[PDB]
Paper text:
The human ubiquitin ligase HUWE1 (also known as ARF-BP1, MULE, LASU1, or HECTH9) regulates the stability of diverse cellular substrates and, in consequence, numerous physiological processes, including DNA replication and damage repair, cell proliferation and differentiation, and apoptosis. HUWE1 belongs to the HECT (Homologous to E6AP C-Terminus)-family of ubiquitin ligases (E3 enzymes). These enzymes are characterized by a conserved C-terminal catalytic domain, the ‘HECT domain’, that serves to transfer ubiquitin molecules from ubiquitin-loaded E2 enzymes onto substrate proteins.
The structure has two molecules of HUWE1 in the asymmetric unit. Interestingly, the pointer helix of molecule A points away from the HECT domain and contacts molecule B, where its hydrophobic helix face is grasped tightly by the thumb, the pointer helix, and part of the C-lobe of molecule B. As illustrated by an open-book view of the dimer interface and a contact schematic, the extensive hydrophobic contact network stretches all along the thumb and pointer helices of both molecules and includes Phe 3955, Phe 3958, Ala 3959, His 3962, Val 3965, Leu 3966, Ile 3969, Val 3984, Leu 3985, Tyr 3988, and Val 3991. Taken together, we conclude that the conformation of molecule B in our crystal structure of HUWE1 represents an auto-inhibited state. In contrast, we have discovered that the catalytic activity of HUWE1 is down-regulated by dimerization, as mediated by a previously uncharacterized region adjacent to the catalytic HECT domain.
Author numbering:
A (entry chain A): 3936 to 3941, 3947 to 4014, 4015A, 4016 to 4372
B (entry chain B): 3950 to 4170, 4173 to 4190, 4198 to 4374
């Protein structure tokens, strides 16, 4: 099933056997049933699957998912909706269904409309739902201030009296689309995909959600705590459901003072709280609906960048269009680092190109009107590359709210490609 | 070339998988990689060694092991140990030995047991017992002495020594027993290749290389060879065309190697396999079995580099810089496999690499340039401690090729 990449005389037959054993081993591990495995031993197997290419992991994902369908008697299931009320009608029709029922084959029927191809109607239906779930009138999701086209949970969702039930429904629909192997135009924030994967956010995630709070954190990290006229404690204010409250980051955080040894830890904890604190119940509802269909441990083989690609698909990126609409600061278009950069980017496969777009823009969503219409925090903001004048042993940094790449003056092409390629991959949970 | 991309993938796959299996606190069958037990032959040495010792403990778990005394004389350890242990049962041999030297001070039993194993391993090879003899080519490696029949009770002794080697493995205690590569193949039930003769009968090997490379009409000369078993000479039938040569060379080499010692081996293997199941030991290669019994050596590469000779190559040749870079990048097991590949053993000479011994006396490690096409592996000739190294185009290619050459077993590039 799974495929691997690709001497004279007696050595050729020796190599082909060597080559076949390696493939046999890989395939046997990936074909092996994992349903006897607990979460601990399964996570160990994930440390191996995680290193494989995206398409291999997607293929393993779909294999294991179908294995979870054993013991099910799948039926065709009708979803009756009105073209004017698709979202609320679909909620009524599906939100009380069981998880097992949701694995049935949906066929949509619009009230009193001419019978069309069921397959296309399902595609049409998904398209409408993915759009309406982000409609402000339901107050479930809101755009991030930084990246504009990405969404996360609206903390003021309690205006809608049924929101918790609706968040569970929306989580169910996202999982159902993945299950049905149908793409959605739902583009969430990087941090939101982390929530699904059960990963903590970094302070860098704050930049596109709450810009000024992010800056305060960077200042705290880069300077001594004594340079502040105020003291800090392991506690922060959170406004859940319109009710403000001071929650402790760690067990006695209100009496614990923020020292230099505590800074990195403080920043880590406070960001987690601010990001998920005002939305913890809406999020828990969403994840309940999601994990009902797609187990958490199973989706955890993907990285936050890849999960988006799983849900929304792999895009085709017109690099010429991007290059035509790139601005340069300190660098010029003909600077050696820039020529290397474009050569490196073109040398990336489809997945890594997408991961790069995610890395600098905050999403894999390509603007319909081309990269001349790339949106940022302050309006239309073209992709821009700045020279990083610090030492050349750091990775390229990004600031997605400006669609900005900070590129050090690397000494060689081999170094630039290697460093850039590392930067676009998943980051660690390290506090620094 | 697409082949090098595959080798690059394969090493990544090797490194990742094995590293996970090393951190594992589970048995391999109980864990998530349980499917691999059927492909245990392909994993790294230490991983197979962990599996080996775990499986060994699991199969005897139903046994109630007690402490067992062995009474010997410090001056007569070998023959006394034969008396105390050679008629004992396999289950008795799986008990915990504690040694008592006749009329000597009671010491730490763990330390005293390590001293008893080191002394018996040195005495197995004493010519006075006429059980083993050194190979002419590699000098420091041993195999069965065909003239073992001088003592008529020898088959009983071959079984005893086989038992002691296995017992040492069972007890997880290392021995200073260094056999020939061919001998380890015998333990694993593997056939020898014509290349193996080079260190056993140099002149015969030359005849075989000539026969293989040239036409049969260039000789002037049947599936039979002379064997001197038990001092009694005989021409034994193996089963001579150009089409049959492949077959002829294979059979005759088997015969010259195993013909005069076939019963002595069967006795040794009987003794060995009583303690250690054959299927379990067969997960190792001929190279690896030695490392299991004798341990992984630590190699001072600086000492080796200081005593390396170069022919056609110079010390500053780019392939030589790559070579040392490749060797340094190898883990302990692969470094050992390299030492085995070019010298014929993993035993580091006590007097340093400046005293490396060869067929015709003292011979330092030497690297020659192989001027033939660069699509072949590095070749070795262990009786000269010689590495034949092609002028490889890149470091990545040289390293990949060297790694394949030192891991090669008689079943190909790693066991099939």
């Amino acid at each position: 099933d799974y495929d691997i990449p690709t001497f004279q005389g007696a050595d050729t037959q020796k190599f082909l056997r060597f080559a076949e054993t390696h493939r046999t081993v890989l395939n046997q591990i990936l074909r092996q049933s994992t349903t006897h495995l607990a979460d601990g031993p399964f996570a160990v197997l994930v440390d191996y699957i995680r290193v494989l290419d995206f398409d291999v992991k997607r293929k393993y994902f779909r294999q294991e998912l179908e294995r979870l369908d054993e013991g099910l008697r799948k039926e065709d299931m009708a979803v009756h909706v009105r073209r004017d009320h698709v979202f609320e009608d679909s909620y009524r029709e599906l939100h009380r269904k069981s998880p097992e029922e949701m694995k049935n084959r949906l066929y949509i029927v619009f009230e009193g409309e001419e019978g069309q191809d069921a397959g296309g109607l399902l595609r049409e239906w998904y398209m409408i739902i993915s759009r309406e779930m982000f409609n402000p009138m339901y107050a479930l999701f809101r755009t991030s201030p930084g990246d504009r086209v990405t969404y996360t949970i609206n903390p003021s969702s309690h205006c809608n009296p049924n929101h918790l039930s609706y968040f569970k429904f929306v989580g169910r629909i996202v999982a159902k689309a993945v299950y049905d192997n149908r793409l959605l135009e739902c583009y969430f924030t990087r941090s939101f995909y982390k929530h699904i994967l059960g990963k903590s956010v970094r302070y860098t995630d704050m930049e596109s959600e709450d810009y000024h709070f992010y800056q305060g954190l960077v200042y705290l990290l880069e300077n001594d705590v004594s340079t502040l006229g105020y003291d800090l404690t392991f506690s922060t204010e959170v406004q859940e459901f319109g009710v403000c409250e001071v929650r402790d980051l760690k067990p006695n955080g209100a009496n614990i003072l923020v020292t230099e040894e505590n800074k990195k830890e403080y920043v880590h904890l406070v960001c987690q709280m601010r990001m998920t604190g005002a939305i913890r119940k809406q999020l828990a509802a969403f994840l309940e609906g999601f994990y009902e269909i797609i187990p958490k441990r199973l989706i955890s083989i993907f990285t936050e960048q890849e999960l988006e690609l799983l849900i929304s698909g792999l895009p085709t990126i017109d690099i010429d269009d991007l290059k035509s609409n790139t601005e340069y600061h300190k660098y010029q278009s003909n600077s050696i680092q820039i020529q290397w950069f474009w050569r490196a980017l073109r040398s990336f496969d489809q997945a890594d190109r997408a991961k790069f777009l995610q890395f600098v823009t905050g999403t894999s969503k390509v603007p319909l009107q081309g990269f001349a219409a790339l949106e940022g925090m302050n309006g239309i903001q073209k992709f821009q590359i700045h020279r990083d004048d610090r030492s050349t042993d750091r990775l390229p940094s990004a600031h997605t709210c400006f669609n900005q790449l900070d590129l050090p003056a690397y000494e060689s092409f081999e170094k630039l490609r290697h460093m850039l390629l590392l930067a676009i991959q998943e980051c660690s949970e390290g506090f620094g």
